[PDB]
């Protein structure tokens, strides 16, 4: 790797600078280098890794959606043949998106997940695994589409099982996992009722636990609870 010669601490420092400069591709490359040093990541470092790749893939997904919409309109009746260019360029963006997802999944499988024993690390990484399979599922159309969807489901489900046993209902990672798995149900698995039930039960169980929290923890938990409520409002 091109980051193999840079100190771990320097990679982390530069990831933080890249975040300040909104240079998310750089941030992701620095964090990939840090992961590849082979040591486990701290809570803050896991956040740097996830923020970097979430921003990179989020931009790719937004671009893919723009191009896919143009492509769909081009294939409507009465539209003029514009040639292969829209499909080609959508495919180019799609292939780059798949490459980034494969890279993240590769870091998780070699070897972040297998060395993650605490709930706060293991749930976070398994949630990421579900997220990146979900992004692959958003663009999938081939023989393996059902297996891609099931890979996302399986990762989210393992994260859910651990989170319910090992974290309080207000834990922000537990809440964010539930938020995203609920979106998986709604958008990917054609299961809007499961999506709504999960978001509602998660919200209600968190509400009942807020009384145990400090002011700062309350702010953290209610932030994610509001996202669950926002999705429920969208879906009902």
């Amino acid at each position: 790797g091109a980051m193999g010669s840079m100190e771990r601490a320097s990679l982390i420092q530069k990831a933080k600078l890249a975040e300040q400069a909104e240079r998310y591709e750089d941030m992701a490359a620095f964090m990939k280098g840090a992961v590849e040093k082979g040591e486990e990541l701290s809570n803050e470092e896991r956040c740097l890794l996830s923020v970097a790749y979430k921003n990179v893939v989020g931009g790719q997904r937004a671009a893919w959606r723009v191009l896919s919409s143009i492509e769909q309109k081009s294939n409507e009746e009465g539209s003029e043949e514009k040639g292969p260019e829209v499909r080609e360029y959508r495919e180019k963006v799609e292939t780059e998106l798949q490459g980034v997802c494969d890279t993240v999944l590769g870091l998780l499988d070699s070897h972040l997940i297998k060395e993650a024993g605490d709930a706060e690390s293991r749930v976070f990484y398994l949630k990421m695994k579900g997220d990146y399979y979900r992004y692959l599922a958003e663009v999938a159309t081939g023989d393996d589409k059902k297996r891609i969807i099931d890979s996302a489901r399986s990762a989210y489900q393992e994260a859910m099982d651990i989170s319910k046993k090992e974290m309080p209902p207000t834990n922000p990672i537990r809440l964010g996992l539930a938020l995203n798995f609920s979106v998986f149900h709604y958008e990917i698995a054609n299961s809007p009722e499961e999506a709504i039930s999960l978001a509602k039960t998660t919200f209600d169980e968190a509400m009942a636990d807020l009384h145990t929290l400090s002011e700062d923890s309350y702010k953290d938990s209610t932030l994610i609870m509001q996202l669950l409520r926002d999705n429920l409002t969208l879906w009902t």
Binding site: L179, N180, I224, L227, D230, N231, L234
Partner: peptide, 5 residues
């Protein structure tokens, strides 16, 4: 799109 984190 719905919210994810």
């Amino acid at each position: 799109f719905p919210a994810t984190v």
